[PDB]
């Protein structure tokens, strides 16, 4: 709105509040990495994440042999040695050296004494491997190519109760398995059995009864039965059967025997629900009744009582001279039946069985088996359970213990078994694994923390093993510590890892959509082949947390989904969504983020509700209580939707006129959004969703002012800004912003920034100054838009193709820039060192043009495909030559050279011009005789920019001093600026206090530049083998050619067909002509209609812009023109300043229209807009035929549609090979377009030839073309001679297979 | 079929079949040295097993 919307006003449709604004889209990675690296004072750095976390986890490396420990106090981070601007060029690693302070003094001493001999601690500083820092954009630039780390999504480390839906069983039934999957430890299971026996298996080992694992713990004997089944008392054989009970359990039970009361009449014959019987028992002063043989007496029964729980015959011993409470309707005997299948009684037996199941084939002992079971689950380091797992277990099962214990508690297993036994009979609900509440996201922070913890554990083991050899007495620190014991573990994470992938830096939209990605693969995720069908499916809890519209349509579909626009992540790791809290009727204005698991026990009301009055008057607002949406009342509505654009991702939010196309087709349009190469001189779309400005200003692609000071001068390559209008005292003089020029991006595409401010034009802090790549006036752009006319044109657009005119190429609107950045090395060899020779032997003199004497092409030199970029010759050993070649050489007298031609050559392509060349030399020789002029020019440019910055700073200093001393003949006194030279001396103090800061700032700048020049003169480091390297930044300016892949804003795509002249195109009325002719047959097939409405709105706004620009052409600043401009726009449009003429210059190209995703313009709105624009209400206009000169006898649709230029170019896709390098072991042509690839003749392609009668085409295409090496040259000789014939004896692959089979015991010998 | 062609930069690149043959040759030589030295049956048995 400040300096962005004033230059170009964009009207917005829909009626939606804008109370809460979406946070920055890159806040996820930044907030995750900030928790790891605190970067604060010493008393700070208190949290469960970061290197300090693992350090406090295991700080002391103690040894019982010598009793020496290492203590941790704190760690400090140093400044980076190389900046990002030099790290990108030098191909270094951007990181900060880590330093930790460790004390070697140990409290333990000999003879059980107290303080050690050395009372004062060592307190030495030990160097550690640096960790890569995070740029403000979150790029993680470890090498010359920045690589970001995507977040991982895996199962939450909590207990789950999943039962199969009658599968993997002989008969229809459910298993009801329970898992205790921890964060870092062995997994546990309590799956049932078809025989109703509880079986426990640890880490998917051999199944054994859970009674053994229960006896292994402290609970032994009848304690396992007293805690699972209740006991009811009975009389010791009194008159009849006197059993004092109560009716809490007799409700709804089939009485097999007469349960009538001894003194009252009850226990009716039917005995159903027993509601009246329950009431009578409640009013009968108890549930006592008078009554068998089959009972498992759970009493803790040596003289009279014995083991086992069953009488079953006659109640022997006269009731031994409290039995059990287990019926067959509500409770089951599964736990009791498990005690009869196990043969282990003593705890030692269970321990031996567990040890045998864990470590098979080994004699178990009571000493070793006890430690194994104690370390398996009850160990701190062995069994780790995060706090989120403990809180999840407490939420699922109430325990009142969290954040204090990490190992599996002995009481938790009993509670889990009880819950499982309860859920087996019923009255329980299983927990789905696909629920979003049971899934947490692991960002880069937790992964890097785990990697650093593993590295620190390895380092601790190494230090403990090495501390025994060296004498601890009379020693010090920094020596008994490995230099790189864990630095490799952190360096391999960024280098080789499924999560950390290449950066998709193709445009400002891809830079912001690649960081909000949630992958499901990697170290601890389901493999693509093990995904299945349930993981790829979408769950109804993803509403507002995961946009189900942005997903790759390849094999890994449903696994690379991204987050929403308002979705966040809690401290635990769950996904959060904002929900505006609403009270009874009157909606509140306090938005609160509701988690996925917590939002289940609430009601949600959708947005777009009538809020004209204080409350919704419809009383039937559509809302989803829990998952499924049902029409609910206005009573007890607690949560309301915050905004309609909450369930869609940032990529899908840019699609204008959404909700009118198919769901599957909209998915393709999202993938094509982040695939358009940035075009030169692009513009914002006429019909935009409004989210483009936020995604443009949020992403790190455009510069933003940091202060309020005005601009001084814009030199194109660097913009200077004043200090501020309200700048602080003794602050920086002026803020200098250098805009990046044409430089190769990560995807081989140009990236440049252009200024937008002029002289003066005071800017407010936090405003975009210069646009980035593919951006204009701050608003995001992807490509130019042209007039479109849906109609078949002589079959040129028969299939899914597009036809364009030559007018689109004449203006050069779709042309882009590319950069290859070839490189070359100069590694030495055993038989002499290589050299960059200016002249290669036996080369033509004409090919040496545009080549410097050093051997590198000059900057700005035109090069063609197959040209010598860098002339390099390597020493070649003596090799035998054919006698005919020797005779020819002796005849001509020339001498054979001893060097081989290995100069770099441009591959087949457009062969653009050179941009920049960079050479690096070894430390031995730097600028001795090569690239001396390059270093001279570099130092001259450095001195020039230093002098310019010093001059501008001195000018600002003089201006500030003049404006400060003006209060107390200055123009005729140039030398009196720093010296008053007057009786007044009060201002001298302030003058000195300002001059000291100015001098220290100038000295800091000079010192920084001197360190820069010293680092440049010192020379960059290279691998030991190579001694010199050169890089050529060749750039190509590609244009739109036939065969290119051009896709629209929606899912519509298509290769560009043959371009026609301007006259052949359809001649519209008033002389205008269309630019593209799309096929209208894609509407019925692909259910997408938003493109038609988009075209109509584009035509309307283009007509409005054409009618408004003509009004100003008559007389500028006309009173009537402002009236029309205010009438057409929905009022902050009129401005008192003179900038109204500048707004008309932008509005002449069409007035921008901003339509929301869900609150877009309805049919009546677009109809009224078309009517006001002057176009016919139907939307279609009469169009003539330019090829013939006749008018079509039917109305046609024409309008402005947003078109993109996809990266699938035709020049990089075409490839043809005749004879290239063959394989090494197979002796076949190599594959891939890198170095003369060959189109693979697949197995399915061989079946096609076998289907036909062709037998000679398939015979020679498999033996003489690639397989046979002997007869491979015979066919070429026959072709070059003129005779068509070939002979194939046997392929090389069959010989290799025969040699392979002979290596084994098999004897494969040929016969006949 | 198990080449050891030197890649660009002086760093060789061999196939994984050389490791198995090298390990087999090393274990065979170790067993041959064990049989000549007249080692105990416990060590000679483990060598044959390996």
């Amino acid at each position: 709105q400040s300096f962005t919307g004033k230059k170009r006003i964009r009207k917005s449709f829909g009626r939606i509040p804008e109370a809460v604004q979406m946070p920055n889209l890159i806040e996820v990675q930044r907030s995750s990495y900030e928790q790891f690296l605190q970067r604060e004072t010493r008393p700070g750095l208190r949290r469960d994440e970061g290197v300090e976390a693992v350090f406090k986890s295991v700080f002391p490396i103690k040894d019982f042999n010598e009793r020496a420990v290492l203590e941790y106090v704190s760690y400090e981070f140093e400044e980076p040695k190389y900046d990002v601007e030099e790290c990108i060029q030098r191909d270094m690693t951007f990181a900060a050296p880590l330093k930790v302070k460790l004390r070697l003094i140990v409290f333990e001493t000999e003879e059980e004494t107290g303080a050690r001999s050395v009372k004062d601690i060592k307190e030495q500083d030990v160097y550690m491997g640096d960790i890569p820092l995070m740029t403000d954009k979150g790029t993680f630039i470890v090498n010359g190519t920045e690589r970001v780390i995507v977040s991982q999504m895996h199962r939450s480390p909590g207990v789950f109760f999943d039962h199969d839906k009658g599968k993997t069983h002989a008969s229809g039934k459910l298993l009801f398995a329970a898992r205790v999957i921890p964060y870092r430890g062995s997994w546990l299971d309590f799956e049932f059995d078809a025989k109703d026996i509880v079986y426990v298996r640890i880490d998917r080992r051999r199944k054994l009864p859970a009674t053994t694992f229960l006896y292994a713990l402290g609970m032994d004997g009848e304690e396992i039965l007293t805690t699972f089944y209740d006991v009811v008392p009975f009389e010791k054989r009194s008159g009849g059967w006197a059993t004092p009970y109560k009716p809490e359990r007799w409700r709804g039970v089939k009485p097999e025997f007469p349960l009538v009361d001894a003194d009252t009449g009850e226990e009716v014959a039917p005995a159903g629900t027993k509601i009246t019987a329950r009431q009578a028992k409640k009013f009968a002063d108890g549930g006592l009744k008078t009554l068998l043989t089959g009972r498992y007496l759970a009493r803790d029964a040596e003289i009279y009582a014995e083991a086992g729980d069953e009488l079953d015959v006659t109640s022997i011993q006269a009731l031994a001279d409290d039995v059990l409470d287990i019926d067959h309707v509500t409770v089951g005997a599964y736990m009791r039946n498990t005690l009869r299948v196990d043969k282990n009684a003593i705890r030692e037996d269970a321990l031996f069985d567990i040890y045998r199941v864990m470590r098979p084939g080994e004699p178990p002992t009571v000493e070793a088996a006890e430690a194994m079971f104690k370390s398996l689950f009850f160990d701190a380091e062995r069994y780790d359970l995060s706090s989120v797992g403990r809180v999840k277990m407490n939420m699922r099962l109430e325990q009142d213990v969290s954040d204090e214990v990490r190992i599996l508690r002995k009481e938790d297993v009993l509670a889990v078994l009880k819950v499982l036994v309860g859920l087996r009979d019923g009255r329980g609900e299983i927990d789905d694994i696909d629920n979003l509440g049971n899934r947490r996201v692991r960002s880069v922070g937790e992964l890097l923390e785990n990697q650093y913890r593993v590295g620190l554990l390895r380092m601790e083991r190494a230090i403990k093993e090495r501390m025994s050899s060296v004498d601890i007495d009379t020693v010090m620190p920094h020596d008994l510590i490995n230099a790189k014991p864990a630095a490799a573990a952190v360096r391999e994470f960024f280098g080789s890892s499924q999560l950390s992938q290449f950066m998709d830096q193709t445009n400002p939209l891809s830079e912001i959509t690649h960081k909000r990605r949630l992958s499901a693969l990697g170290p601890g995720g389901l493999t693509r082949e093990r995904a299945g069908f349930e993981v790829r499916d979408v769950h109804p809890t993803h509403y507002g947390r995961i946009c189900p519209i942005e997903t790759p349509e390849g094999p890994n579909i449903g696994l690379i989904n991204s987050l929403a626009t308002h979705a966040r992540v809690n401290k635990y790791g769950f996904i959060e969504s904002p929900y505006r809290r609403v009270k009874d009727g009157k909606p509140q204005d306090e938005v609160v983020y509701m988690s996925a698991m917590e939002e289940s026990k609430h009601v949600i009301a959708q947005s777009n509700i009538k809020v004209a009055e204080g409350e919704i008057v419809e009383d039937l607002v559509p809302g989803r209580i829990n998952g499924e949406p049902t029409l609910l009342q206005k009573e007890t509505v607690d949560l309301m939707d915050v905004s309609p654009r909450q369930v869609v991702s940032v990529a899908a939010a840019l699609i204008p006129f959404l909700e009118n196309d198919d769901a599957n087709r909209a998915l393709m349009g999202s993938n094509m959004q982040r695939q358009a190469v940035p075009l030169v001189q692009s513009d914002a779309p006429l019909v935009g969703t409004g989210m483009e400005a936020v995604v443009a200003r949020d992403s790190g692609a455009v510069v933003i002012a940091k202060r309020t000071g005005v601009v001084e001068q814009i030199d194109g390559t660097r913009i200077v800004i004043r200090a501020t209008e309200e700048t602080d005292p003794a602050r920086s003089g002026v803020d200098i912003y250098r805009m990046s020029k044409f430089q190769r991006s990560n995807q081989s595409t140009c990236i440049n920034q252009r200024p937008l401010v002029k002289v003066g034009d005071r800017i407010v802090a936090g405003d975009i100054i210069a646009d980035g790549p593919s951006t204009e006036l701050g608003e995001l752009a992807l490509g130019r838009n042209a007039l479109v006319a849906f109609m078949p044109w002589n079959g040129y657009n028969f299939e899914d193709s597009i036809l364009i005119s030559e007018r689109i190429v004449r203006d050069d609107v779709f042309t882009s820039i590319h950069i290859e950045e070839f490189e070359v090395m100069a590694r030495d060899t055993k038989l002499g060192p290589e050299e960059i020779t200016r002249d290669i032997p036996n080369v033509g003199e004409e090919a040496l043009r545009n080549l410097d004497e050093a051997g590198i092409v000059a900057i700005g030199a035109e090069v063609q495909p197959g040209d010598i970029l860098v002339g390099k010759v390597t020493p070649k050993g003596e090799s035998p030559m054919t006698p005919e070649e020797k005779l020819l050489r002796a005849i001509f007298g020339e001498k054979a050279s001893d060097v081989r031609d290995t100069s770099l050559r441009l591959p087949p392509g457009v062969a653009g011009t050179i941009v920049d060349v960079r050479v690096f030399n070894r430390h031995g020789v730097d600028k001795d005789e090569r690239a001396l002029a390059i270093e001279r020019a570099e130092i001259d440019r450095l001195g020039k920019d230093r002098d310019d910055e010093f001059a501008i700073l001195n000018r600002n200093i003089s201006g500030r001093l003049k404006e400060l001393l003006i209060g107390k003949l200055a123009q005729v006194a140039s030398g009196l600026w720093w010296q008053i030279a007057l009786e007044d001396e009060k201002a001298m103090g302030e003058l000195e206090s300002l001059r000291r800061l100015f001098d220290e700032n100038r000295k800091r700048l000079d010192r920084r530049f001197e360190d820069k020049v010293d680092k440049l003169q010192r020379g960059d480091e290279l691998p030991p083998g190579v001694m010199k390297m050169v890089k050529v930044f060749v750039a190509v300016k590609r244009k739109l050619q036939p065969g290119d892949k051009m896709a629209g804003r929606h899912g519509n795509k298509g290769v560009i067909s043959r371009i026609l002249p301007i006259e052949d195109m359809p001649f519209l009325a008033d002389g205008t002509h269309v630019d593209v002719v799309l096929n209208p047959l894609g509407v019925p097939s692909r259910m997408n209609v938003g493109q038609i409405f988009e075209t109509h709105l584009g035509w309307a706004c283009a007509n409005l812009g054409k009618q408004i620009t003509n009004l100003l052409e008559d007389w500028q600043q006309g009173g009537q023109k402002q009236a029309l401009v205010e009438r057409l726009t929905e009022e902050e449009l009129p401005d008192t300043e003179e900038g109204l003429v500048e707004l008309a210059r932008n509005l002449g190209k069409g007035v921008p229209i901003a339509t929301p995703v869900f609150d877009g313009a309805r049919m009546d709105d677009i109809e009224g807009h078309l009517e006001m624009a002057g176009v016919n209400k139907s939307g279609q206009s009469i169009l003539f035929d330019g090829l013939t000169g006749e008018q079509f006898k039917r109305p046609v649709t024409v309008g402005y549609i947003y078109m993109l230029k996809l990266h699938h170019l035709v020049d990089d896709k075409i490839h043809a090979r005749s004879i290239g390098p063959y394989s090494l072991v197979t002796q076949q042509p190599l594959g891939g377009k890198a170095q003369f690839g060959g189109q693979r003749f697949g197995e399915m392609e061989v079946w096609a030839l076998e289907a036909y009668g062709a037998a000679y085409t398939l015979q020679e295409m498999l033996t003489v073309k690639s397989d046979d090496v002997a007869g491979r040259t015979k066919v070429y000789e026959s072709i070059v001679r003129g005779d068509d014939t070939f002979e194939a004896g046997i392929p090389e692959s069959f010989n290799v297979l025969v040699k392979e089979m002979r290596s084994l015991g098999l004897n494969v010998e040929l016969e006949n | 079929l198990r080449p050891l062609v030197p890649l660009d930069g002086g760093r060789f690149a061999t196939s994984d079949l050389n490791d198995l043959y090298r390990r087999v040759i090393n274990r065979n030589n170790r067993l041959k040295r064990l049989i000549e030295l007249r080692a105990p049956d416990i060590i000679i048995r483990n060598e044959k097993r390996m």
């Binding site: 098979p360 084939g361 080994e362 | 097993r49 390996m50």
Partner: peptide, 11 residues
């Protein structure tokens, strides 16, 4: 009683 480990059997 199956092991499938030569070093385990040796130890």
């Amino acid at each position: 009683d199956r092991t499938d480990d030569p070093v385990r059997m040796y130890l």
